[PDB]
Design a protein around this ligand. Structure first.
Ligand SMILES: [Cl-]
Lengths: 256, 256
């Protein structure tokens, strides 16, 4: 649909790499949706221009600017920079529904069916499964929800010191209400649960639709051998394949 | 209710300690339900007699006996000893509904409301949260279900090499169907998620109703200082308090 989007976020050039890989993965699996990326001014012109090619829309967010609605809350809780920036995904009222995906996710199959879901649909978090992981979620842009999230951020902050605590606190019926708001874990498959919980992977992890690179060493903190097509494991190598294949050439293209 | 029960299982004297602590924890939080314990002949007379005091019913299961319905399946899949024994929880047709709890769980509050639940209700597993953890679950005893589980055990075994894989495979709609069959994580709170996922604990882990001692070192593999009332952490110490207070005296009582 025209007014639906995957939305991601990048606050720096490291994460812009992820966002570019994510965007590409989404294009590769023939999404019929828009691709939007929240970006900060800290993202350089080269990453930016590549984001402009990969994404239908590049939105600038500067919570460091006092014009930003999140800025006073950033002052109150300065650890919440990334969180308050991320929450701007709710400002995107040019879209009726979006799938937010962190820039450290990777799409391995079309996940457009996520748009059948209602706010707030998200996959369970490993570790504390009565929380949803905020790495992938379905939400409806709204200035009201935005303001309410912003307000909760101000009042409580996040029990996680990040967006996950904040989102779970506001969307707190997730655990106990409407199983359709549980996204299958395969739509936000923790790369940790692929290596750590290895019995459950073998049986279901070949079904993965989205890899969420958690931790730790993010995909781009790895060394990739372009000859062997392998890092210094399966999923890191898909990410790097996309990076090497689609993203680097788009990045090297901006220097002329 | 008269014909409802918590059911646990012990295949040896190490686990009988857990079962005795579990049973006691259940009595301590004034359950109105029956307490049943599947036991193997490998459980010694002393553990047994103490089980007889703590539990309303002590049921003997010997899958090593060829009279047992599970025995031929044990022959086919000998790694499934514990699993096939556990599955006998479904034979307990003297009960209309039961809560099965592994002998490495600990009850910290009345959880009798679990009997409002239908088969198969269970808490999500940490690590792979689209599986339920088989440490605590609500089920309806039935020879049909039993036979069907036994049959699946024979055909597929368990993708986990344990009961969890088997149960998830048979009760495979759990992830996607009926949010009421998701037991809050606090009814099967992984002791690992208490130490490992520490941000989510502080906010919700004080609400714990059942601790599931996973791993690893089981509670009884720890040294307990009875003077300091502490092990060699909060939950280990509740377990040991119950053990020292209620269980050991019941065990020392059998030697005369
Ligand atoms: Cl439901």
């Amino acid at each position: 649909m025209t007014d639906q989007a995957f939305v991601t976020l990048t606050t720096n050039d490291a994460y812009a790499k992820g966002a570019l890989v994510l965007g590409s993965s989404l294009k590769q699996h023939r999404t019929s949706r828009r691709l939007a990326v929240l970006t900060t001014p800290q993202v350089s012109d080269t990453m930016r221009k590549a984001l402009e090619i990969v994404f239908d829309e590049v939105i600038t967010v500067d919570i460091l600017d006092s014009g930003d609605s999140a800025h006073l809350t950033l002052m109150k809780r300065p650890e919440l920079g990334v969180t308050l920036t991320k929450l701007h995904c709710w400002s995107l009222t040019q879209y009726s529904k979006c799938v937010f995906m962190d820039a450290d996710t990777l799409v391995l199959a079309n996940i457009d069916d996520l748009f059948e879901r209602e706010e707030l649909s998200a996959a369970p978090d490993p570790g504390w499964p009565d929380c949803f992981n905020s790495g992938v979620f379905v939400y409806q842009p709204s200035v009201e929800t935005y303001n309410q999230l912003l307000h909760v951020a101000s009042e409580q902050g996040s029990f996680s010191g990040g967006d996950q605590g904040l989102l779970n606190t506001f969307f707190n019926s997730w655990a106990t209400t409407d199983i359709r708001k549980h996204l299958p874990f395969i739509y936000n498959l923790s790369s940790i649960s692929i290596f750590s919980y290895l019995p459950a992977f073998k049986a279901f992890g070949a079904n993965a639709k989205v890899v969420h690179f958690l931790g730790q060493t993010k995909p781009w903190n790895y060394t990739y051998d372009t000859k062997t097509k392998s890092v210094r494991p399966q999923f890191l190598n898909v990410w790097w394949d996309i990076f090497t294949t689609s993203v680097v050439p788009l990045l090297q293209q901006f220097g002329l």
